[PDB]
Amino acid sequence: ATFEIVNRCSYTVWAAASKGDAALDAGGRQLNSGESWTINVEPGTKGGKIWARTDCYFDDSGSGICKTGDCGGLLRCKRFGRPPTTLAEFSLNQYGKDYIDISNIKGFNVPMDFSPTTRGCRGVRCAADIVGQCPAKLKAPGGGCNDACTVFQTSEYCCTTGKCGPTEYSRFFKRLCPDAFSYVLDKPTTVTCPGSSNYRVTFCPTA
Length: 207
Fold this sequence. Notes:
mainly beta; 6-stranded antiparallel sheet; 4 helices
């Protein structure tokens, strides 16, 4: 399948694409403002993620640091990144359908549109100034708006017992992006698409 990753923000990002224990495609790439990067994701891949990283440095050998979303110091992510990261999430071809979501469960760093480029299903978006508004205790230094489970480390915010409610903090994310997951047991805003669809991720879509 095809992922076209478009940076419509006015600042450079370092896109990432991982499933958790391996890169997707090249696993990451600088995208200056306006630049695009199309990747190939192997059919059926379950649980993949695409995110932006901000304020990075990488050396010649690709190793470095980013202030949001860092995946173990690699330009080319083979693992997931450090919150706060807005997440595009997907599992493809799982019995005749792909399922797409955007998640604020690890926080938010960059607004995002995640729309199918082939018919049948509707995209999802979170474009609101979450970082401009973000509650003080959830602010990150380094940039972005952390989730409560990162900042506090409780069973209720992390949903560790499998029983958790919405919180004042989950609801701050759901007031501003009702189509994105705001905590682990949120009512699903998943989208079911035909198997083997293609997609576009766009950062700073309003921009």
